[PDB]
Amino acid sequence: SWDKDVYPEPPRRTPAPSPQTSLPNPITYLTKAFDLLVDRPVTLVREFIERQHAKNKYYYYHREFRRVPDITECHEKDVLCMFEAEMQWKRDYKVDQEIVNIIQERLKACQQREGESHRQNCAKELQQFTQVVKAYQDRYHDLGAHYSARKCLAKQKQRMLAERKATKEAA
Amino acid sequence: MTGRQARAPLQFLPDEARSLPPPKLTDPRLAYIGFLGYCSGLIDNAIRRRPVLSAGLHRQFLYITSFVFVGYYLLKRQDYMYAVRDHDMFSYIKSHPEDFPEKDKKTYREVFEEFHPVR
Amino acid sequence: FGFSIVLVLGSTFVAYLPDYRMQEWARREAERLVKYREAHGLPLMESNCFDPSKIQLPED
Amino acid sequence: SHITKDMLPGPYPKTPEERAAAAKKYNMRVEDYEPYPDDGMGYGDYPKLPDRSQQERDPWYDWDHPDLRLNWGEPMHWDLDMYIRNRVDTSPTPVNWNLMCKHLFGFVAFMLFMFWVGETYPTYQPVGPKQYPYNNLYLERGGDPNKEPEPVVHYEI
Amino acid sequence: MLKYIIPTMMLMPLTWLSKNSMIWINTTLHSLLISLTSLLLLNQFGDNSLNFSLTFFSDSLSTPLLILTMWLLPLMLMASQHHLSKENLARKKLFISMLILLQLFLIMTFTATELIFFYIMFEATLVPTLIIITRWGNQTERLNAGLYFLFYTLAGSLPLLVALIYIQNTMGSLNFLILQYWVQPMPNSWSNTFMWLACMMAFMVKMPLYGLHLWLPKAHVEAPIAGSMVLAAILLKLGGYGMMRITLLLNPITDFMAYPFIMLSLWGMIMTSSICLRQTDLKSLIAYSSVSHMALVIVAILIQTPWSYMGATALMIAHGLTSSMLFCLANSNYERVHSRTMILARGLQTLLPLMAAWWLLASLTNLALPPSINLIGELFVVMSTFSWSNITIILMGLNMVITALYSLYMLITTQRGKHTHHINNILPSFTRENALMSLHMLPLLLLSLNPKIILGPLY
Amino acid sequence: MNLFSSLTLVTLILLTMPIAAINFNTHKFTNYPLYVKTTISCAFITSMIPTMMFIHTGQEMIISNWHWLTIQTLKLSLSFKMDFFSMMFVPVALFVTWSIMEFSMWYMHSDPNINQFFKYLLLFLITMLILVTANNLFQLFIGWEGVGIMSFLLIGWWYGRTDANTAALQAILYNRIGDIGFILAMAWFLINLNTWDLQQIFMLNPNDSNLPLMGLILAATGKSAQFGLHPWLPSAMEGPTPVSALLHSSTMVVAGIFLLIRFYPLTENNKFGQSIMLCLGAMTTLFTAMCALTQNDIKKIIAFSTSSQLGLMMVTIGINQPHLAFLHICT
Amino acid sequence: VVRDHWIHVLVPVGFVFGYYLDRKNDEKLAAFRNKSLLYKRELKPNEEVTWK
Amino acid sequence: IRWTCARSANVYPNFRPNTKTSLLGALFGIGPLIFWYYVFKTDRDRKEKLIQEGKLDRTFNISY
C-alpha cells in the first residue's frame, strides 16, 4: 500500500440492499459466477509469482543528500560554489513541482468521491490548495525559462522590497 | 609581443627553454601532423598517376618522417613561447601591486540585481 | 540491423531506462516531504525559499 | 532534350512577329490570341482564356484527359492550379448572382433582427422564484461555511 | 563523445578501400552500429548536463537531435542510390565519404561547448552540402540554388563571429556553464540591440525567417535526396538549436526588439501556408511547409516559456522526421514519372496499393493527427502564445486549418482517383522504398507511445 | 468493486484484436465479417452488464493509468471515466454499429476490398468510443480529430468521383474549425485553471467564462453541422450508405453537442451562454426545416432531418437540461 | 576469416579505442575525488577509490 | 512543361516597377503586419499596465 497519513480517504460506507422482490437478483448470480471463474485462477497466478519471487530478493534505497549552505553565501563569481547551490535549488524545484502534483491529485480525489456534494466536505482541500498555489504563484512563477537560481533571488528581493516600502509608506 | 630577448636575434631556443618539459610521445598534435604527412604522401601518389596507396612507400615514410620532425620542433618553440608569455605576465603581476586591486567580493546577501520579470 | 536488432531493442531500451530527469526519485521524495509537513503541522510549501532573515535590502 | 526557345519571355511588341511566333508556339487561333497586356505583374506573354473551362465542356465529347477536361494541346489557362473541378466549380447558376446574394444577406439579417427583437422581449409563464431552504441555499454556494449568512427566510403564502 | 567521433574517422577510409559491389553493405552495417552506439548515450539525469573534458557535453536540447542525425544517416544513405548508380565507383565513394564528413561535422556541431567552436562547426556544416547540391542537383539551376545557399548562410552568419569575440573578451571564456554562471543583463542601450540583432539575425537567416526565406525553395527543388533531407531537417533544426543555445544570455532587451521578429514570423507563417497551397512542382510544397513550421518554431523560441521550449523541441524532432520521409516519397514519385510537376503524376490508388498507405500516414502526421508529435509541439506552442498575448490564437488556428488543407490537398490531388492512362511505366514499389518508409514511421509511433524523452531541458 | 471497472476495460479492449489480427495475418481470411460480428456482439453483451450495475447502485467511477509527461504542475495519464452519460451511451452506439456491420455485410457484398473497409469502420468505432469515455480533455481532443480523419477516409472510400473527395475535404475543413474553437477552450482552461481535466474544471466555478464558451460553441457548430458550418452534411451524405448511417446517425455528428452536454456544471451559470445556445439552435432548426422542401435525394432529406434534430438538442441545452438531450441522443 | 575479411571489424575497434581514451580521460581529470561538499563520505572499505 | 516553366522561373523576367506593382506590393506586404503590430502594441500595453496594477485573475495563473 502506502502511507494513509499522506494519501488519506474518508471512511468507507456500504449500505445493505433489501428486496422487496423475488426474482432473485441476477447480478448476484453473475458476480458469483465472475468470482468463481476469474478470482481464483488470478489468485493462483499471483500466489505462484509470490512464491517464485519469495525465494530471493533485491533492494533499492531512496537517495538522500547533505546540505550545501546557500547561494547567498557565495561570492561575486564563485564558479564552484554556485554550482552546488544552484543544483540543490533545482532539485528543490523538482520536488516542489511534485508536491503541487500530489495536492492536485488530492483535489481530484475529493471531486470524484463526493459526487455532487462538493461544497460540503471539500472546502478544506480547496482552501489548502489555493494556499499552496498562492505560495507557488508568488515564488516560482514570473522567472522565465532561463532560470538558474539567481533570478529567483532577484524576484525575492524585489517582492520583499516592494512590500516593505508599501507597508512603510502606508504605515 | 616585442623582445624581451631582443638581444639574441635568432636564438631559436635558449637555456630558458631547457627547463620546461618537451612535447611528449603520442601527444595528439604530432599525431595529427603525422596523419597530415600520410595524406601528403597519398596525394603525391595521386598526382603523378602512379597507383595511390602503392609503389611509393619510401616516399610515404619520407614525408611522415619530415613532417613529424618539423612539427616536433615547432611544438617545442610554441610551448616555450607560451611559457615565457606566462612568466612575463606574472612578473608584471608581482611587480606592481597597486594597479591591480583585490575587488572586495561582496556575497549575494547584499549584491542588488535589477530583475525585469519576463512573462 | 534496422528492424530486428535496432528497432525493438531501442523500443525496449526506451520502455525502461533509469529515472530520466530524476522522476520517480522526485515522486517518492515529495511523498515523504509532504508526510513530514503533515506530521509537524507547519504549512506545506512555505514561501520564501531563501531565508527571509538572510537578506539585505538596499534602503533609502 | 528540349528547345530553350520553346519557353516564353517578353511580351507582344512588336505586333507582327510576336503574334506570329505566339500563335505558332501556343497552337492557337492567330488573332484571337490576346496578351494580358504587359501589365508588369510577371505573366509573360501567356494567353488570356475565358476563365471557366471546367464545369463547361460536357464530358460526352470524349477527349483525352478524363478528369482534367483537357485534350493535351491547348494554351493551358494560367489558373489551372485553381480553376479545376474539385476546387472551384463555376457552373452557371440557375437564377442570378446579385439576386442570390441580396436574398441570402436579407434573410440572415432578418433573422438577426428578430433575434434582437426576441432578446428585448422575453417570455415567461406566471411563475415566481424558487424557495430554497437555507436562506437561498447557503453552504452549497461559494462557501464561508460558518462565517456570513444573510438571513432571509421565506414567509408562507 | 570521442567514442562517437573516432569511429566516424574509422568508418571513412574503409569506404575508400572497399572493393567493388561491397561499398554499400559495409557503410550501411557500420552506420547502424553507430545508431546503437548513439542510443547508448541517453542518460541525462536531473540537475545538470552530462559533461566531458572541455569540448563535449550533452543535454536534451542536443541528445535527441544527435540521435536524430545518426539515425538519419543510413536512411539518408539508402535513399542515395539508383540515381547515381551508373556513375563511377570513385565518384560514388567520393559522395558517400562526403556525407560521412558532413555527419561528422554535424555531431561536432551538436556536441559543442563553446559558441566559437559552434561557429566553426556551423560553417563546417555549410561547406559539403554546397558541393553536393550543386554537383548532383539534376536541374538547370542547381548552380543558382547552391549559390543562394552559400551566400545567405555566410552573409548572415558572419557578424555573429564578431559578436562572439566581443562576448569572449568581455566575459572570459565561452563555456555554456560559465555563461550560465557569469551572465548579467545588458540594458536598453543601442549597441546591445545591435549585438542581439547580429546574433539573432544570423540565426534568422538560418531558420529561415520570412524576410529571407527565398534561400530555401531553390535549394530544395535543385538538390539530390540525401542533401535534401540533410539540408531541411538537420540544418533548420541546427539553426534553432543554436538560437536556443545563445538566447540564455541577453534576456532584458528581447522584450523590446523581439516584437518585429514575432510579427514577421506570424504573418509570414500565414502567407507561406497560403503559398504552399496553389503552387505546382510537388517537391516545393513540402519546402514551404517546412518554412511555415520553422516560423512557428521561431515564435515559440522567442516568446520564452518552458511550455514553449518543450513544444519547440517536440515540433523540431517531429517535423524533421516527417519532412525527411515526405521528401523520400517525393523522390519515389520522381523516380516513377520523371516530372517533378504535380498535376501530371496522377492516380496511384489502383496502382501501388500500399505506397499510398505511406503517403496517407505521412500526410496525417503532417496534418497534426493527435498521436503525432507534430500536434504535441503545435499544442504547447499554442498554449504558450495564448498566454503571451490572448488574441494571437486566431493566427495559430488559421495556420492550423490551412495546414491541414494544403497537406490533405497534396494527398488527394495526385493520389486519389484516376490514372492518366498514358503513364504506363510504373513498376510496383521496391522493397527498398518501403524499407525507408518503415524506417521513418515506426520510430515515430514508438516515440509517440512514451514521448517523455524528446521534451526539452525544462522537463 | 473492481468488477465494474474490469468489465468496462474489457469492453474497451475487445475493440483491438481484429485490427492487429489482419495486420499480422499473412494467411487470407474470408470470414472477417463473421469475426467482427462475434466480437462486437460480445462487446455489447459485456457492456450491458455495467449499466445494469449502474442503475442497480449508482456507483460512479473513474479509472486512470500509465501517466506520461508529468512535466509542470499538471500531468496526464490515459484516464477515462464512467458516469451516467458514458454508461448509458456506449451500448447504444455498439448496438447501432453492430446492425450497421450486418447491413454492410449485405450491401458491400460485391466489392472485394471489404477488409480495409471494416478496418476503417472499426477504427472509427474505437476512436468515437475513446471520445465518449474520456475525462482528460487531451484524450477528448484525440477522439475528436481521430473521428474527423476516419470520416475523411470513410467518405473518400470510393476514389474517383471528385464530388466525393471534395465532400471529404469539406468535412475535414469544418473539423479544423471545430479544432480552433476547441483549442481556444483548452488554452483558457490551462491558463486560468492550471489544467485541462473535467474534474477540476467542475471543482471550480470560474464565473467569467465568456471566452471559453464562445470557443466551445465554435467547436460545437463546427462538429455538429450547424448554421454557418452545416453544408458538409448532405455533401457527406454523398458517400456510401453504411458510411452515411454510422457516420451521421449515432456517431461523429452527435459528438458536437456531446461536449456541451458534458460541460453542464460549467453552463449551469452564464445565461448569456444559454441565450447563444438556443438562438443558434433555433436558427439551424428553421433553416433546415425550410431547406428540406423539394429535395429529391433521399439521403439529403435525412441529412436535413438530422440537422433539425440537432437544432432541437441545441435548444435543449438552451434550457439547463442536459439529460433530456442525452435521452434524445439515444432515441 | 578475419585476415580474409577484416572490413566488418574496424569501427568496433574504433569504438573500443574511443572508450579507452574516455577512461584515460577519466583518470586524467581525477581531481576533487573526495573533496566535494555534497558527495563526501569516508573512503571505505575496499581500496582507496570512489570512482574510476 | 511550357506552363510550369512559364509559371515558375519565367516570372521574374519580365517585370518592371510601375506605380501599380510598387503600391500593390507595399500594400500587401507591410500593411497587415503593421496592422497586427499596432493591435499587439495595444494588447501588450493593456496586459502590462493591468498586471502592473493587480486586477487580474492570477489568484492562480501557474503555467507561465
Side-chain angles (χ1 to χ4, degrees), chain D residues 60-123:
Chain D
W60 292 105
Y61 175 80
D62 294 332
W63 56 85
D64 173 70
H65 290 89
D67 288 333
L68 287 175
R69 272 70 183 272
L70 260 292
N71 202 351
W72 179 77
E74 280 197 1
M76 298 291 171
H77 187 205
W78 182 258
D79 284 330
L80 194 271
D81 286 325
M82 187 266 284
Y83 280 163
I84 329 103
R85 60 174 298 162
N86 80 5
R87 173 70 85 195
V88 171
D89 295 332
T90 66
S91 297
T93 62
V95 279
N96 276 317
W97 187 61
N98 290 320
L99 197 280
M100 283 176 64
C101 68
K102 288 177 185 178
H103 273 283
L104 192 147
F105 289 164
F107 177 72
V108 174
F110 174 73
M111 290 305 294
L112 291 178
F113 182 75
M114 298 310 292
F115 283 165
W116 182 255
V117 171
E119 283 183 352
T120 188
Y121 292 168
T123 50

Side-chain angles (χ1 to χ4, degrees), chain E residues 247-457:
Chain E
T247 187
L248 190 145
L249 59 93
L250 288 176
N251 38 353
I253 44 90
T254 190
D255 295 334
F256 181 70
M257 201 55 71
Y259 291 159
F261 288 168
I262 297 299
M263 281 302 297
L264 183 60
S265 297
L266 286 178
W267 182 250
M269 179 181 66
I270 300 301
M271 289 300 292
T272 305
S273 293
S274 177
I275 198 176
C276 63
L277 200 155
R278 203 179 177 275
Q279 291 178 356
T280 59
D281 287 329
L282 181 64
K283 176 70 173 293
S284 67
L285 295 178
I286 313 105
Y288 291 98
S289 308
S290 177
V291 177
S292 178
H293 283 285
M294 297 309 106
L296 182 61
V297 168
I298 276 305
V299 178
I301 297 303
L302 276 78
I303 57 176
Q304 286 181 353
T305 289
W307 299 90
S308 179
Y309 285 165
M310 290 183 284
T313 183
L315 183 58
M316 283 182 186
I317 298 161
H319 189 80
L321 291 173
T322 299
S323 63
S324 178
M325 184 195 177
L326 194 57
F327 281 165
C328 182
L329 288 98
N331 194 12
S332 178
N333 197 2
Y334 179 75
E335 284 183 352
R336 294 297 182 272
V337 299
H338 295 283
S339 177
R340 189 183 287 111
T341 62
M342 177 178 69
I343 207 69
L344 180 58
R346 293 177 63 195
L348 281 77
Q349 281 305 115
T350 68
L351 305 169
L352 285 80
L354 194 135
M355 193 70 201
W358 295 108
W359 280 99
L360 175 63
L361 188 65
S363 179
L364 290 177
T365 56
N366 196 4
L367 190 149
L369 181 139
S372 175
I373 311 298
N374 190 359
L375 186 133
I376 290 175
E378 291 177 353
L379 186 65
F380 288 130
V381 177
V382 162
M383 298 300 104
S384 174
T385 194
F386 188 76
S387 180
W388 185 64
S389 287
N390 291 113
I391 195 65
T392 180
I393 195 166
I394 294 169
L395 291 173
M396 293 296 172
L398 193 144
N399 188 14
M400 187 70 74
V401 173
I402 290 178
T403 303
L405 196 150
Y406 67 77
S407 180
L408 197 54
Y409 177 70
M410 184 185 72
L411 181 67
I412 61 100
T413 309
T414 68
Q415 198 160 3
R416 192 70 70 88
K418 180 54 175 289
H419 59 88
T420 65
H421 65 273
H422 61 81
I423 301 301
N424 65 11
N425 59 358
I426 52 95
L427 301 174
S429 182
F430 297 108
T431 58
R432 181 187 67 195
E433 298 293 326
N434 292 318
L436 269 75
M437 301 308 109
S438 54
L439 283 167
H440 283 99
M441 285 296 105
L442 296 178
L444 183 61
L445 298 178
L446 293 177
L447 193 276
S448 300
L449 288 178
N450 197 357
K452 69 182 179 66
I453 296 166
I454 53 96
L455 276 75

Side-chain angles (χ1 to χ4, degrees), chain A residues 72 74 76 142 150-151 157, chain B residues 107-108 111 113 118-119:
Chain A
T72 54
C74 300
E76 295 178 356
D142 198 359
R150 300 178 68 249
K151 291 179 69 66
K157 282 188 178 181
Chain B
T107 189
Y108 277 172
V111 175
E113 296 180 354
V118 289
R119 277 74 177 261

